[PDB]
Amino acid sequence: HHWGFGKHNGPEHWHKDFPIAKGERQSPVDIDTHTAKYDPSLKPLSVSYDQATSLRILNNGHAFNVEFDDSQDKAVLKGGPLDGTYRLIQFHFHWGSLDGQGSEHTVDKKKYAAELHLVHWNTKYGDFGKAVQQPDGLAVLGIFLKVGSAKPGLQKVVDVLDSIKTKGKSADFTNFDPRGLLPESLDYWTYPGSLTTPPLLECVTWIVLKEPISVSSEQVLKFRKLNFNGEGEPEELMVDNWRPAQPLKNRQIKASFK
Ligand SMILES: [Zn+2]
């Protein structure tokens, strides 16, 4: 027995094992576009993924992560509301059982079909494990996905899901360019938050892009064929692996545009 997204171990139950679930800077949150404040002080985001080295894709029971070599500054995020350099370590998605839900953050209560999270850690802390213990340890880039035209750069990811259908399975996944997943514009909102699944640490500086990226119904459908369970166990489709919006509390969402 452990946390998950079922009826008996879902988000509403997490607080019992992870008290921080009721913390002061929990994520995700609803972005009210009319209360977000434009901040001219915010610099443009600097995404340098030209030297990114993807290594593997794995199904960890609650999503699938596409891991990168973070032993050097190969793929980094700088600028924006960030101080210092943040290295990309992995990216994953959260999606729903229907196209009308799936994203974690919502914009004016609007839910998207899915949400892509590119996780980066602050190099000043040495390693990922140390970074999660700091208030400015991680910087996650969030991108919304809407159902429409297919996204060419995502197909490579879609085609390998068959090999990692169940929990614990992994597959070599080299030479994948994450630049194919970015929208045209880099305008964003940002606020201090946390990791949206246990252990829900409040070490995140969220940077959610305003412009969604379109994927076809066929591409999202393949996400829904994954399993939460391990091989040989009863099948339970991996869908609705998103946490609902949490109270904003004493936080301000800033926008890089107006
Ligand atoms: Zn995530």
Curated annotation (Swiss-Prot):
It comes from Homo sapiens. Changing residue 119 to A/G/I/L/S: Reduced CO(2) hydrase and p-nitrophenyl acetate esterase activities. The record marks 5, 60, 65 as: Fine-tunes the proton-transfer properties of H-64. Keywords: Acetylation, Cell membrane, Cytoplasm, Disease variant, Lyase, Membrane, Metal-binding, Osteopetrosis, Phosphoprotein, Zinc. Interacts with SLC4A4. Interaction with SLC4A7 regulates SLC4A7 transporter activity. Interacts with SLC26A6 isoform 4 (via C-terminus cytoplasmic domain). It is found in: Cytoplasm; Cell membrane. Pfam families: Carb_anhydrase. The record marks 90 as: Involved in the binding of some activators, including histamine and L-histidine. Changing residue 60 to T: Reduced activity. Signal peptide: none annotated. The keyword Phosphoprotein applies. Disulfide bonds: none annotated. It is linked to Osteopetrosis, autosomal recessive 3: A rare genetic disease characterized by abnormally dense bone, due to defective resorption of immature bone. Osteopetrosis occurs in two forms: a severe autosomal recessive form occurring in utero, infancy, or childhood, and a benign autosomal dominant form occurring in adolescence or adulthood. Recessive osteopetrosis commonly manifests in early infancy with macrocephaly, feeding difficulties, evolving blindness and deafness, bone marrow failure, severe anemia, and hepatosplenomegaly. PROSITE patterns: ALPHA_CA_1, ALPHA_CA_2. It catalyses: hydrogencarbonate + H(+) = CO2 + H2O; urea = cyanamide + H2O. The active site is at residue 62. Residues 1-257 form the Alpha-carbonic anhydrase domain. This is Carbonic anhydrase 2. Changing residue 62 to A: Reduced CO(2) hydrase activity, rescued by 4-methylimidazole (4-MI). Reduced proton transfer. Enhanced proton transfer. Enhanced proton transfer capacity. Changing residue 104 to D: Normal CO(2) hydrase activity. GO terms for cellular component: apical part of cell; cytoplasm; cytosol; extracellular exosome; myelin sheath; plasma membrane. Belongs to the alpha-carbonic anhydrase family. Changing residue 65 to H: Enhanced proton transfer. It is an enzyme of class 4 (lyase). InterPro entries: CA_dom, CA_dom_sf, Carbonic_anhydrase_a-class, Carbonic_anhydrase_a-class_CS. Changing residue 117 to E: Strongly reduced activity. Substrate binds at residues 196-197.
